[PDB]
Design a protein around this ligand. Structure first.
Ligand SMILES: [Cu+2]
Length: 249
């Protein structure tokens, strides 16, 4: 794959990233202001779907590692866990909303979160996307979805994990789709494989959908169901890992 042939997919991935940030900013506005207005109910129904935008751009969170750890960090990323004042973002607000069932003291965390999403948009505006970090970030995100997220660790309090899994798989697929034209040149069998693998994982999550387009609580998956998904998700990581090889990255 010639270097110049990598320019096209990246710039389209950026438009993609942009549209998700346009959608995130909006949904985070409605979401945060519901939190600050003490409407614990509205904020709970908006939580998972709001994050989908953020969870689809997670294959490149390294390119904004600081805003990542501000927006989407979790309790065990802080030495004082759920009562650490360094804990910010969705999952901090998730604790109050779902676990403790209140909005008390969440107004500060809400505005800071609104700030970070705006700052994330401002960043990516003029941020360049290394192709190996785009493909590589995808493969690893699949690696950690199968290895670590599978535990239910990301949304401890709401158990909205399947929303996030879906958004991760969708964001990762988008990348496979934008690179398929370069890949299919010498590895059509492999491109076809990757599609069928993603298709499998989507068909797997679809068993947990409801008509709204939402998902059952993650607890509802037995530890056997978890291991079956993990195996299917791990296949995705493997492919993205070999896809970046095949493209010369
Ligand atoms: Cu996340």
């Amino acid at each position: 794959v010639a270097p110049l042939d990598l320019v096209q997919p990246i710039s389209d991935y950026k438009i993609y990233v942009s549209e998700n940030l346009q959608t995130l900013v909006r949904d985070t506005r409605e979401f945060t202001n519901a939190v600050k207005a003490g409407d614990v109910a509205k904020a709970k129904k908006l939580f998972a779907s709001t994050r989908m935008s953020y969870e689809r751009i997670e294959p490149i969170a390294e390119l904004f590692s600081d805003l990542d750890a501000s927006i989407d960090s979790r309790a065990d990323d802080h030495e004082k866990a759920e009562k650490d004042p360094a804990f910010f973002g969705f999952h901090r607000i998730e604790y109050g909303l779902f676990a403790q069932n209140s909005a008390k003291g969440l107004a500060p965390v809400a505005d800071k979160l609104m700030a970070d999403v705006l700052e994330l948009q401002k960043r990516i505006r003029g941020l360049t996307f290394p192709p190996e970090k785009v493909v590589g970030g995808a493969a690893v995100l699949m690696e950690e979805v199968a290895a670590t997220k599978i535990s239910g660790e990301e949304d401890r309090y709401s158990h909205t994990d399947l929303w996030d899994f879906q958004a991760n798989f969708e964001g990762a697929k988008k990348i496979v789709d934008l690179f398929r034209p370069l890949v299919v040149k010498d590895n059509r069998a492999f491109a076809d494989k990757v599609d069928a693998n993603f298709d499998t994982v989507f068909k797997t999550l679809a068993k947990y959908r409801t008509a709204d387009g939402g998902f059952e609580l993650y607890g509802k998956l037995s530890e056997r169901d978890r291991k079956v998904l993990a195996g299917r998700v791990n296949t995705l990581a493997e492919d993205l890992s070999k896809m970046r090889g095949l493209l010369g990255l």
